[model samples]
Target: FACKTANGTAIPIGGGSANVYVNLAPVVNVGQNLVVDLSTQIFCHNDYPETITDYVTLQRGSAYGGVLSNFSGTVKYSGSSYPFPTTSETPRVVYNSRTDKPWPVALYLTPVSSAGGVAIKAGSLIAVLILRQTNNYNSDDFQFVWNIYANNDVVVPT
Candidate 1:
């Protein structure tokens, strides 16, 4: 993903996409609740003039059949940290403003019980982050993808 000005001028700064892997070291099983802290894993360098609004969208692969809930996290920038919304069903609307230069985000997710008291199947889960900036006569949108694998076989001793 890339960004450019409304005049079609590329903003040669820090604007790109990446695929982040949230290593759930210990194997996770169906109906097993866990918290994946990504505070130090994700970072972004924002040199754009316009403030970027970040939105999150989740996509589950065919192998997995479960729902994720309680999407919450914080953005640390400009020497300060701000909390994001925690109570949302899906497709949450987050933010990353210019005031918070060089934003480092931390996200959390909860794998809820599967339908009909069933266990969540093993598979891959993806989170698509949409970043948008809309200024006077200038607008751009970028996307970043995050991958998470859910399995019940591999075990990690505490």
Candidate 2:
């Protein structure tokens, strides 16, 4: 998705936003998980009391408008400065066409309350995955950090 800035102007007291480029070529089909590494440091208005509540979402574009998905996972803020409340669930899966196209995954962080502007910083690494779909398409491609292997290569991480 696209981003709008004040051109050095601080983010308004209550409105601020940022967009990141997360691309995985040849996206895998359903039932596959992709672990992404988010960039360290998010963008904000550069004001005091950076107490901004954030919401991380998965989208299918580099701009603001696109198909968005929600997943479960812990968002660690600044290496233990601010961490998500839950870490039990991982985000849902993302799918895109196989034709040499870039499906961007964008993350959004907005203030929980109508508080003043704050930083919309991002992290270094972010992980995601897709659950099994009802209709299994053999030709579909699933994109992920770890290689997907058949039953023979399956091994538990120690």
Candidate 3:
């Protein structure tokens, strides 16, 4: 719903659709290394006019408590509810958990290695993020920043 720097690019602007397309399981334990799974997905929320290489971005609203790590993740071809069954997808989390000013980092996951090829459909499932959430006294916000490679931005929190 909020985007910028799209000059000739089509960022996360859901004209007749949506902004954030993600969901988390119910096993977000507050302690004990609360291992959680966040299936992150996205697409060209709006039209692709500039054909940027990568427009996917991530943001950490806040961080504290135990710890959070992007233990594992998988990126694959775009789909509605699931990534392609094909293997060797290179899209993965490229951010580190820390106390950075903007938060963890900009990129929550690397954009699909398959760029300049297929057009990111209107809505496509991107990846399944296996996250390690360990925070007994933490407040986090995961947000997605649809942007062009020129610059940046989840809704997942600890």
Candidate 4:
């Protein structure tokens, strides 16, 4: 299915809150924009209206671990959950959008530690641009997941 960001614009990631939507189960074309509803509570938690100066990295993997592409976007943090107070600045990537090329089977996301670093916790969503499988094509399949961290290391994984 296709997903779109909350504000409908790929910029200012955490203006309000983050949400998701299901557009189409199977697409049959290239350059298809996945419309998803995003909430600042999921993506840009506690860091609303942050500037996405550097490029947001996109990776392809086998069930949530691997490498893929280097997509760019201005990411921000919005909301937070329990244990981590509302003052927490957490950044995440979810299945926001994708391409229809029938390759690079899946998509994944992570925090950009170089561009000032990001805080990753449980339930964070990451956005990724990827291609799916079509007829007469068998590409290397992969799965994706949200990688959270803190202090310049992968904290959420544990």
Candidate 5:
């Protein structure tokens, strides 16, 4: 499997992993919401069935206060969409019965406080996507890593 941008750019999966750089439009601001679209192209070698599991982690810098709101995934081949089991905790699993297809995933981040206050700041925002493969949970099961960079544009009030 390989990770690619929405534009179908081949993001090399070095060591079975890769990092995706996402530059939010106009940069993230306080009381704003950012939606990012990501996808993975699966190219299997055999006909054996496999499952794709995604684990997400949010690393907020010292100046950022916002939290990840909605993280979801969809199988383009099946037109099925599902929300993450838990934000920044649980892993989202996608069952793939077919090979050589694209799976689109959506990530939503809100830079607002629960009390309607400004929670965004000028700092670093890192979103890590851990992709894992499972097939009978044997030695064949392996995992990869992907990252999203805000490019220091995730800004909030000082």
Candidate 6:
């Protein structure tokens, strides 16, 4: 997204909307629980009835030919000085190709609840994923996608 401006003055850099990085979090072997640590950032603008949110998904790309799943232990907000209420949710893995991002074994996550600006910060750890891995997949055979819904540095017209 582009930086925004308010009254001709550029708005300060946001904590950032959100993101995900990792060629592949870990290698999964036959019947194993893989602990995956994620590096990401999530920022949302909260005002009155409008509180932004963030969405992150871990997908098993075509290169991944093994079973993959996850259980959310917790999402730690790696930001300095918090604003939004402390809450989040981790959805079960969707093992089919449906929805905007058509990827099998999608590990989904979102930090939401309040309709207010809450940021996980620009650079920080969002959560730790405990994946239920079976079968076998090559190293770095995964992809990360973001459906982050937030204010992309734009001045809201009143």
Cα RMSDs, all models: 9.4, 20.5, 18.8, 19.5, 7.5, 19.8
Give the per-residue lDDT digits (tens) of candidate 5, residues 1-158: 33444444443422254545555554554445566555433222223344443221221111112334321222111233333222232333444444444434455554534323233233435455555544443444445555555543444433
**Which 10-residue window of candidate 2 scores lowest in summed lDDT?**
146-155
RMSD value for candidate 4 = 19.5
Could you tally the backbone clashes for each prediction?
A: 0, 26, 9, 34, 2, 4
| Candidate with maximal TM-score | 5
Clashing pairs in 1: none
Clashing residue pairs, candidate 6?
46-116, 46-117, 51-115, 51-116
Model 5, global lDDT: 0.40
Candidate 1 displacement at residue 102 in angstroms: 6.6
Answer with 1 or 4, whichever has the higher lDDT.
1
Better of 4 and 5 by lDDT: 5
lDDT pick, better of 1 and 3: 1
Q: Evaluate model 6: give its lDDT.
A: 0.23
lDDT of 1 by residue, 1-158 (tens): 23332223332332444444445534444444344444445433334436444442221111122323322233322234443332222333343443332223334333333322222334545343333322233444434433434443223122
Shift of residue 104 alpha carbon in model 3, Å = 14
lDDT per model, in order?
0.35, 0.24, 0.24, 0.23, 0.40, 0.23
> Tens digit of lDDT per residue, candidate 2, span 1-158?
11122222222323333323344322222233323334321222112213322222221112111111222223332233122222333333222222221222223322222222211112222223211111122232222221111111111111
- What is the Cα-based lDDT of residue 22 in candidate 5? 57
- In candidate 6, stretches whose alpha carbon ends up further than 4 angstroms from where it belongs are 1-115, 135-158
| Runs with alpha carbons beyond 4 Å of true place in candidate 4 | 1-118, 129-131, 137-158
- Misplaced by over 4 Å in model 1 are 1-17, 25-33, 48-123, 133-137, 149-158
Worst lDDT 10-window in candidate 6? 60-69
Who wins the lDDT comparison? 5
State the number of backbone clashes in model 1: 0
